Design an enzyme around this catalytic site. Structure first.
Site, PDB file in Angstrom:
ATOM      1  N   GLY A   1       0.758  -1.257   0.000  1.00 22.30           N
ATOM      2  CA  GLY A   1       0.000   0.000   0.000  1.00 22.30           C
ATOM      3  C   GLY A   1       0.782   1.298   0.000  1.00 22.30           C
TER       4      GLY A   1
ATOM      5  N   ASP B   1      14.374  10.915 -13.418  1.00 17.36           N
ATOM      6  CA  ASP B   1      13.142  10.960 -12.628  1.00 17.36           C
ATOM      7  C   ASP B   1      13.266  10.213 -11.286  1.00 17.36           C
ATOM      8  OD1 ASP B   1      10.621  12.017 -12.099  1.00 17.36           O
ATOM      9  OD2 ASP B   1       9.536  10.497 -13.252  1.00 17.36           O
TER      10      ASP B   1
END
Ligand SMILES: Cc1ccc(NC(=O)Nc2cnn(-c3cccc(C(=O)Nc4ccnc(C)c4)c3)c2)cc1
Length: 350
Positions: A27, A145
Site C-alpha cells: 500500500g 526521474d
C-alpha cells in the site's frame, strides 16, 4: 495440475505461482499493484508487482518493455534485482498480465524521510543512491526521474533504486487514468526542456537530501510554473551563462520572471535541523550543508558530478575496498498495442 492460483488483494486479482503464499498489500509503497508474499521454493519473503495489460497504451508499454529488458542486463546491489518473471496466461493471444518478483524490502524512502536520522544513516543512504546512480550511468542509463517513492530500504539501512526513469530519445504520451506524476525532484534541465548529462540525477539526490534535513518537499507545485518559482525564490535567479543555454522561447519566460537574490545555504538549512550535541555532529552538519550547496545548483555546469559527490568528505567514509564488482556472479520507437503485446510477451518468455 494448475501451476497458479488466484487471490483477491485489495481491489485487484493476483494470479500467482503456487510457490508464493500469504499475499499481503504493501500500500505505502506502492501504489503500483504490489504485494508481499512468502516464496516456499527459496524459503524467503518477496515483493510481487502485477502489470495489468501493460500493452494497453504506449506509455505503459514502452515503460514495461524497457524496464523488463533493463532489469535483466543491470546488476548492482543498489539497483532492483529481479528474482522471477511470469504470466498466468498460456498463449500470446490469451496474454494479459505480467508479474515481477523481487526481494521484499521494509519501507520506501518517503517513510525514512519522515524520520529524524543520524549522519551515519543519512550519508549511508546517500552513498548507496550515488553508487546506484553511478552504476546506471556507466551502463548509459541517465535516470532523470529519481524520487523517494521508487527507492526502497531495508531495516539494516540497505537501499535499492526500483526503476530506470524517463524514456531516452523520447517522448511522453497521454494518460486516461486517475493518478498524479511526482515532478518535485526533477532537475531544472528537465523542468525547462534543456538537454542533459549524468549530473541531472545529482539534483534529485539534492532534493531528497534537503528533504531528509528540512522534512518538507523543497520544490513543490501544481506544475513546472509554480515549481520553477519555488526553485528561484530559494536558490535565486541563475547567472547569464546558464540562461544562454536555454531555447529562445524558454529563455524569454525565465528572464521575464521576477528576479530573486537567493537564500544562503545556512538560511535554507539552519544549524537547528542538524544535531549540535557533539563536535563530531558539528563537523558532520557543515559537511552535509556543503554537499547540499553543491547539489542544489540550478546551472548543471556549476553542479557537482556523481564522482565528486562520492569523493566528498560527507560521503567518502563508506568507500569499501575489495567490494567491487559483485559477490553473487533497443528499442525506443513507435509500436501499436499488438506489436507491444508481442514484444513484452516474448520478453516474459525469454
Ligand atoms: C520487481 C518489482 C517488484 C516490486 C516493485 N515495487 C515495490 O514497491 N517493491 C517493494 C519491495 N519492498 N517494498 C516495500 C515497501 C514498503 C513497505 C514494505 C513492507 O511492508 N515490507 C515488509 C512486509 C512484511 N515483512 C517484512 C519483513 C517486510 C515493502 C516494496 C518494483 C519492482
Amino acid at each position: 495440475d494448475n501451476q497458479f492460483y488466484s487471490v483477491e488483494v485489495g481491489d485487484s486479482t493476483f494470479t500467482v505461482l503456487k510457490r508464493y503464499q500469504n499475499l499481503k498489500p504493501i500500500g505505502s509503497g506502492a501504489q503500483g499493484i504490489v504485494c508481499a508474499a512468502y516464496d516456499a521454493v527459496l524459503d524467503r519473503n518477496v515483493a510481487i508487482k502485477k502489470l495489468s495489460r501493460p500493452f494497453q497504451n504506449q506509455t505503459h508499454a514502452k515503460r514495461a518493455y524497457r524496464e523488463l529488458v533493463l532489469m535483466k542486463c543491470v546488476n548492482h546491489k543498489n539497483i532492483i534485482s529481479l528474482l522471477n518473471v511470469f504470466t498466468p496466461q498460456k498463449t500470446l493471444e490469451e496474454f494479459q498480465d505480467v508479474y515481477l518478483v523481487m526481494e521484499l524490502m521494509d519501507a520506501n524512502l518517503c517513510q525514512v524521510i519522515q524520520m529524524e536520522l543520524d549522519h551515519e544513516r543519512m550519508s549511508y543512504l546517500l552513498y548507496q543512491m550515488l553508487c546506484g546512480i553511478k552504476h546506471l550511468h556507466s551502463a548509459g542509463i541517465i535516470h532523470r526521474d529519481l524520487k523517494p517513492s521508487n527507492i526502497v530500504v531495508k531495516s539494516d539501512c540497505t537501499l535499492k533504486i526500483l526503476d530506470f526513469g524517463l524514456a531516452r530519445t523520447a517522448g511522453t504520451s497521454f494518460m486516461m487514468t486517475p493518478y498524479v506524476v511526482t515532478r518535485y525532484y526533477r532537475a531544472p534541465e528537465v523542468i525547462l526542456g534543456m538537454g542533459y548529462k549524468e549530473n541531472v540525477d545529482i539534483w534529485s539526490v539534492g532534493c531528497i537530501m534537503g528533504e531528509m534535513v528540512r522534512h518538507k518537499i523543497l520544490f513543490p507545485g501544481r506544475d513546472y510554473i509554480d515549481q520553477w518559482n519555488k526553485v528561484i525564490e530559494q536558490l535565486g535567479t541563475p547567472c547569464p551563462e546558464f540562461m544562454k543555454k536555454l531555447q529562445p522561447t524558454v529563455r524569454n519566460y525565465v528572464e521575464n520572471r521576477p528576479k530573486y537574490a537567493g537564500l544562503t545555504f545556512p538560511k535554507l538549512f539552519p544549524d537547528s535541523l542538524f544535531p549540535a550535541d557533539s563536535e563530531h555532529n558539528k563537523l558532520k552538519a557543515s559537511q552535509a550543508r556543503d554537499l547540499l550547496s553543491k547539489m542544489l545548483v540550478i546551472d548543471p555546469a556549476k553542479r557537482i558530478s556523481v564522482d565528486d559527490a562520492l569523493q566528498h568528505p560527507y560521503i567518502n567514509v563508506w568507500y569499501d575496498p575489495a567490494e567491487v564488482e559483485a559477490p553473487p556472479p533497443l528499442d525506443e520507437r513507435e509500436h501499436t498495442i499488438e506489436e507491444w503485446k508481442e514484444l513484452i510477451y516474448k520478453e516474459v518468455m525469454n
